[PDB]
Design a protein around this ligand. Structure first.
Ligand SMILES: *[C@@H]1O[C@H](CO)[C@@H](O)[C@H](O)[C@H]1NC(C)=O
Lengths: 50, 50
């Protein structure tokens, strides 16, 4: 019963959270550590053989 | 400068002593060869994949 009495507030908060996370995924440059680390490990392991 | 090099410590550009223009070095087209076939009990034809 609490959802239908605050549907507009929940929708606005969801849109605000989506916008904030879209801004934060590009603002922070260290938020993509794992994929960059594993591709750098693959590149280094390929380069050290040569 | 006599000849060049790259990141992978391989010869890339070679300058001949006869003429001042420089020549790049790129190795021959190498790659694995793969076979695409169905079961031998079904058919006999094969496909060659490079
Ligand atoms: C010397 O090098 C030049 C480069 O163009 C060539 O034309 C000439 O025939 C060469 N002569 C000798 C001494 O081999």
């Amino acid at each position: 019963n609490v959802l239908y009495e605050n549907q507009k507030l929940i929708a606005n908060q969801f849109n605000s959270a989506i916008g904030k996370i879209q801004d934060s995924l590009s603002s922070t440059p260290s938020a993509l550590g794992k994929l960059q680390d594993v591709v750098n490990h693959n590149a280094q392991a390929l380069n050290t053989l040569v | 400068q006599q000849f060049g090099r790259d990141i992978a410590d391989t010869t890339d550009a070679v300058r001949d002593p006869q003429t001042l223009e420089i020549l790049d070095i790129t190795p021959c087209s190498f790659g694995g060869v793969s076979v695409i076939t169905p079961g031998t009990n079904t058919s006999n034809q094969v496909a060659v994949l490079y």
